[PDB]
Ligand binder design. Structure first.
Ligand SMILES: O[C@@H]1[C@@H](O)[C@H](O)OC[C@H]1O
Ligand code: NA
Length: 129
């Protein structure tokens, strides 16, 4: 799958600790996110050109960070996307960050880190050139 496509969060290959649920904007979100949870998207093709990451997120708390790691849940970090409260678990906004240069095909781990409690819900994400 292309890094530059819209990747629905619920389309993960593997996950730890989360649950999918009905998303107010349509489709599903990955919710029940606590510090240390993650989702994995296999065989993402970055080509040569990546510069950024955009995630569609909601949070009734104070959010947290999405660590973007390659090939394992503790693997090389290529960006950390800050996520901020939106006042409701089903009112979404765009969280965005820069991403270090990378090439080729990798399994992408989105590793959710933050304070105590639930962090945010993730509807979909994408990378930008
Ligand atoms: O959306 C989820 C909500 O349904 C649950 O009650 O709290 C955790 C959130 O992620
Ligand atoms: Na979704």
């Amino acid at each position: 799958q292309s890094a530059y496509s819209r990747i629905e969060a619920e389309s993960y290959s593997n996950q730890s600790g989360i649950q999918t649920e009905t998303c107010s904007e349509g489709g599903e979100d990955v919710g029940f996110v606590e510090n240390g949870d993650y989702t994995v998207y296999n065989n993402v093709d970055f080509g040569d050109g990546v510069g950024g990451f955009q995630a569609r997120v909601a949070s009734a708390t104070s959010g947290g960070n999405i660590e973007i790691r390659l090939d394992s849940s503790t693997g090389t970090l290529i960006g950390t996307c800050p996520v901020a409260g939106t006042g409701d678990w089903q009112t979404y906004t765009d969280a965005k960050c820069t991403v270090s240069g990378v090439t080729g095909k990798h399994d992408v781990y989105l590793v959710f880190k933050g304070d105590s409690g639930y962090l945010f819900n993730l509807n979909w994400f994408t990378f930008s050139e």
